[PDB]
């Protein structure tokens, strides 16, 4: 009956997504003012000795009387879907909305599920920290909590570094270490600087904005970079990584585009020039089925295509971990209950990507965004190169894409 | 019908070469003034995320209707010639003029081919960046754009370093890494300080000069060093490397001169002394056929002969890559169309020199001209020595020729 990533489950809860997207703007003034509640709650959530608020809520609910069965099955299904989504803005939003839907469905007698997304309660950074960064649902053996704890320390330290804007104090790298789109939601909001492209029922109902925060950067705190800075006409919220999660025909379109770039030229023209030419003269952003897709896609600067396709490591992880047949595909009903039960017992939740790889990617993005020295950059670049080559990817040398794009 | 390096194709387009040589003077005042248009356009062209203007023009022309055939054949012929020319001033000028000739011939309905060489359009640095530095016409396999992109980043960074006058900020070397002469054109212009030698229809029609720029350094921005600085009576525009490209009997004359130096002495006299004696007492710069050649050659200080013949690496690359039989020799007509067609399909365009070698040479010239530390100079010297010895050359140790000549 319930299946995640169904747009209806989000279209019927606008009173909640409004409050979520309203409590996730960065402060308007550069200086915090007096004390911006979302930022202080986030800084408390990234503490090294704090408790995951999602797990805390789950235990204060389930460990009461008569926790209904099939709740663990719906939770396992939501976790299986979040295991196959790109780390981006639309993914966090959809996960939050579907989590709230499950809670309102099965546990109606709970206390404050009508105001869940407020400070001192579950917010966006908590949803990310539970479902995507340091996932808290994969089955693990008892003798395997040590390496995970250590990598968790490094993860959280460098995330706090990304957020605060200054590299960690004490760290030397060496000697350490369902068929329905969402494009209306993306195009509806995001009238800030997130497009900068050529020009510049979801769209109608996606019009609201707060005032206490910077309404030019948009809902940053949902993104996996906690901000929107841009250099050389490339930004820290890759819109292609939203398209990967907001439409079924996006990953295949980008694969076809990459094949065209690689194969439709014989000269030694630089790849950015190939992209600019394929987009400019022989328009390949018109022969796309959805009007909203190619309307939100033809307003992406070619530097962004270059970054996403050939340069950035996080975009490669997204492009290689998503699976739009699971997010926008029906499941054989005769096997549905069997699959639900198998997930409840923890049988198919495959890790996906490694954990050292994610920590290394976050370290790299931290040194790419915030300030950094030299002897750490030149070394994290080499290590990222070797690890990415091992794991089965092929991107340009990382020093270039660390000094050119942001 | 059309063949490159024919002096007639340049003698009939003086209204264009005048504007090209007028828009390529360094600014008169040391400080830019307000904003010197050529310099700002160049700084935009050496950006790490910009588009090659030559390829952009070629696509905005050819990818329109009825791009005539045999245009790709003439373009392939021009590229084959530029594949066999010395990196110098006369080479860039001739390539620009012949490119404009081809464009005016085949694409007459184009928009502004009468004012092509203006700022915000094709200029000299763009011609160099297309035809000589990071050549954009060699056929390459699809799986070979990565190493090329990385080397391109380093190339452009250190070229910008040569131009701006300060070494790159973030760089640690270790842990990284047709029978008709042109001599009238050279002797006609270049009444600045480019000769400093003994004394001090092309020449008649080579008299024009702008006023907004430094008319003492001459058209620097065509050279491969973007300036004319000189130390110890040796300059950064090697005139011998112009002779290599402006006369058929130049490479053989210099080879004979080198053989005389090496073989006509038994004592242990230093090589600069051998040069000074061979030029002074037993004049060997009179028994030269062309009057213009030995008139423009006997005004070259012996330090310059020494540099070009035995010391500098770029001059060795020039002396070993040029091929004056291709630039000043007729082709067997029964095979002309076959050769043109074979070039159009990309069959004979051999790379020539490596790409790491060119990047290393530019790094060396950058540290030789601009400011630099120590731990980078002493190491690039060793690496250049080893690479040059591998590639089949024999020059003096590079530290000396880095501290003595400029
Ligand atoms: Zn948790
Ligand atoms: Zn992306
Ligand atoms: Zn080019
Ligand atoms: Zn020379």
Residue numbers in the entry:
A (entry chain D), B (entry chain C): 3 to 179, 241 to 263, 279 to 484
From the paper:
We reveal the structure of KSHV ORF68 and its homolog in EBV (BFLF1), which adopt a novel fold and assemble into homopentameric rings. The central channel of ORF68 is lined with positively charged residues that are necessary for nucleic acid binding and production of infectious virions. We hypothesize that the viral genome is threaded through the ORF68 ring, and that ORF68 acts as a scaffold on which the terminase assembles for genome packaging.
We purified BFLF1, the ORF68 homolog in EBV, from transiently transfected HEK293T cells. The internal core of the protein, including the first two zinc fingers (residues C54/C57/H132/C138 and C316/C319/H386/C393 in BFLF1), is structurally highly conserved. Residues 180–240 (corresponding to residues 178–219 in ORF68) and 264–278 (corresponding to residues 244–258 in ORF68) could not be resolved, suggesting inherent flexibility. While we found that ORF68, BFLF1, and UL32 are all capable of forming pentameric rings, the significance of further oligomerization (e.g., the stacked pentamers of BFLF1) remains to be determined.
